[PDB]
Each structure stands twice: as C-alpha cells, then as structure tokens.
C-alpha cells in the first residue's frame, strides 16, 4: 500500500527557568528532517537535500517572525502558562509493600515497595531493616511514565526473613511534607 | 539536547491518502492536549487542565492547513517517495499494584509506530472488549516515529486473562501482548 507523510515539530528548550531558552523547529518528510531552525544558530538551514533551497526561502520569508516566536511562544508559554500548571502539578504517591512469593520459610525472598501515581518524577525510596538502612539487596525499575501525567516505580528487596524483624519502605517526594513509611512484618 | 524542561508547541502531522492529520502540544513529554479537527475544539489529557488557561483551537487548524500544503509539495519534490512502515512494539503493565477486586487500569505501551496509523484494541479471555478504554493521541518519538498508549480500566480476577491487540501495516499478522495477575 502507498503512503506519504509529513511532520512539523516545534520545540522549546528551557534551562534554569527562562534564563536560557532555545527554540528548534523541524520540517520532516516521512522520517527525513530536511529544514530546521535553531535559536543558537539563528536562521533556517537545510539538513538534507529536499531542504537545499527551502532554507533560502524561509529566511527571506519568515526569518524575522520566526526569530520572534522565541518569546511570543516559548518564553510566553513557560512564564505565562507553565508555571501555574505543569510546573505546579503535585501528585502524591502510593506506597505498598508486596511479597515476591507466598510466605517465607526463611529463604531468599524479595519485598516489593510500590511507589505509584506520582508527579513530578523527583523521588527517593529506600528500605530499612529495623531502622537500619538496607544498603544492599535493593534494586529498582527504571522509573516508568504512565502517560496520564503520573509515574510509578518498584523498589525490590532481596532478604531472608527471621521473626520479629521489621522492614520499612521510606518514601520521600516533593509533594509530601512528611515522608510516607510503610512497614511489613513476618507475622 | 540538554534542558530542564521541554515543550512541544504545535507539533503537527499530516499524511495521505486519507487526509489524516494531527496537532498537539506536549510539555516535559506529556500530552497537554490535542485538537479535534472535526468538532474543532481543544481536547485535553486531563479534566483538571484547561479549566483556566485555554488555547485557541483555530491556531491548530492553521498548522494542519500549512502542513497539508507542505505535504504535497514535498511528496512531489521527493519524486513520490513513500514512507517505510515499521514494527510497532507494545508492552503491558498496570497503573497501580494488582489487587483482586480493586480497580486498576491496564496499560499497553506501543512504541516505534509509523506511519502514524495503527489499531490498538484490548482483549479479555481471548474476547474483545470495549469501554474502560482510553487512547492517547499519536506521540512523537525522537527518531520521528510514534508511540501511543491504551488504558483499560478494569478489575483483577483470579481467573481472567487480558491481551493487547496491535494491528499495523508494519506487521504481517497482529501482535499480541499477553498479561494476567500472578
């Protein structure tokens, strides 16, 4: 089956708030970016062939206006719209401890702290064995992005349970005042 | 590229035959919203959103338009060179922990989509299901490919089994990611 596609991407890059903004727009045919505009650069440029003369035209025609969208669009949006929304969003997480496999004989098992539905993504999780920082045995998944503006993440713990032992999953995040702690006992 | 925050403002896509287009805005990697070309309005990813700072939907129609244009022009100039399909790759996982009887959403993450035309569907016990199903607009991947996500709100069941059905011109026969509670 015959098919043809063209895309246009407009990207705004910000470092340290708005005290450093970069703007890049790409014009793509199928998966070929032929033309491009970069603030750092200054003018439209050809990236491939299809864009050879396309460059020369966009400057003659849009250069000015374009160079100006860096504010009307990038700076504006950020300062005017992002601060009150996106950059403000604060979704507290959910913590739950689970067990690798049904009950413990006293063998090698693994506890699954489950930090879910949070946002933004800056977060700190860590286990404890009776108030003691479990240094080794911990491992976690590369943080997951649910796509509905929330993240999740699992922090496992390789351990051998005895009795009277207490395992705590300390969870810290910007959305929370006080860190959530979730205990677990080999009852 | 390095940066603290990154906004995609006006990311527009068009393709034909079919005259199928898309206009969306994403911040720090998420779908702020998209634009419904028919009902011609601003459609967000979350309710809680545009309940204050809105977006003039026309602005989008104006990039889809420009693109329809740029599309043709390029088609010809490239010597009617066709886009190459790809093999979308899906993966399934739960929004929250798995607890029987406790609501949850099943998620199918299909990546490497392209051309931006695919058909994702869910399946419980080898039977198709509808509702409790939401779909994200096609989303841009660095290598100008696409990824989307299908959410199936449901409830664990000791028995029940679910599969994420992925159809695309980039797959001879449908792909099926299976998933069920241990």
């Amino acid at each position: 089956e015959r098919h043809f596609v063209h895309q246009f991407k407009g990207e705004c890059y910000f470092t340290n708030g708005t005290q450093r903004i970069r703007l890049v727009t790409r014009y793509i045919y199928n998966r070929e970016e032929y033309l491009r505009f970069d603030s750092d650069v200054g003018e439209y440029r050809a990236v491939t062939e299809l864009g050879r003369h396309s460059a020369e035209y966009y400057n003659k025609q849009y250069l000015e206006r374009t160079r100006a969208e860096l504010d009307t669009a990038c700076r504006h949006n950020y300062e005017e719209t992002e601060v009150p929304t996106s950059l403000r969003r604060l979704e507290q997480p959910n913590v739950a401890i689970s067990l690798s496999r049904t009950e413990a004989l006293n063998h090698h098992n693994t506890l699954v702290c489950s930090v879910t539905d949070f946002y933004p993504a800056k977060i700190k999780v860590r286990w404890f064995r009776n108030g003691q920082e479990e240094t080794v045995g911990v491992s976690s998944t590369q943080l997951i992005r649910n796509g509905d503006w929330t993240f999740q993440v699992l922090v496992m713990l390789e351990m051998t349970p005895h009795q009277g032992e207490v395992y705590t999953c300390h969870v810290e995040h910007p959305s929370l005042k006080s860190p959530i702690t979730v205990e677990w006992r080999a009852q | 590229i390095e940066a603290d925050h990154v906004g995609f403002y006006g990311t527009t896509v068009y393709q034909s035959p079919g005259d199928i287009g898309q206009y969306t805005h994403e911040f720090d990697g998420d779908e702020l919203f998209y634009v419904d070309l028919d009902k011609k309005k601003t459609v967000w990813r979350l309710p809680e959103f545009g309940q204050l700072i809105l977006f003039e939907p026309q602005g989008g129609l104006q990039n889809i338009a420009a693109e329809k244009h740029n599309l043709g022009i390029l088609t010809k100039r490239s010597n009617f060179t066709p886009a190459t399909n790809e093999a979308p790759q899906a993966t399934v996982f739960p929004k929250s922990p798995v607890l029987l009887g406790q609501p949850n959403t099943l998620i199918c993450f299909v990546d490497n989509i392209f051309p931006p035309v695919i058909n994702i569907t869910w399946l419980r016990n080898s039977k198709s299901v509808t509702d409790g199903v939401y779909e994200t607009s096609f989303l841009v991947n660095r290598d100008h490919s696409f990824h989307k996500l299908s959410y199936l709100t449901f409830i664990p069941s000791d028995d029940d089994i679910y599969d994420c059905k992925v159809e695309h011109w980039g797959l001879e026969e449908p792909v099926l990611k299976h998933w069920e509670p241990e």
Binding site: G10, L23, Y62 | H25, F55, A66, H69, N70, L74
Partner: peptide
C-alpha cells in the same frame, strides 16, 4: 486570561 501559543508552521514555496 493568558492563552497558550503554538509555534507557527510556515508554508513552503508554491
């Protein structure tokens, strides 16, 4: 109030 702006997609030569 303030509204979100979307980068302008510029047309190519006709």
């Amino acid at each position: 109030a303030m509204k979100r702006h979307g980068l302008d997609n510029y047309r190519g030569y006709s």
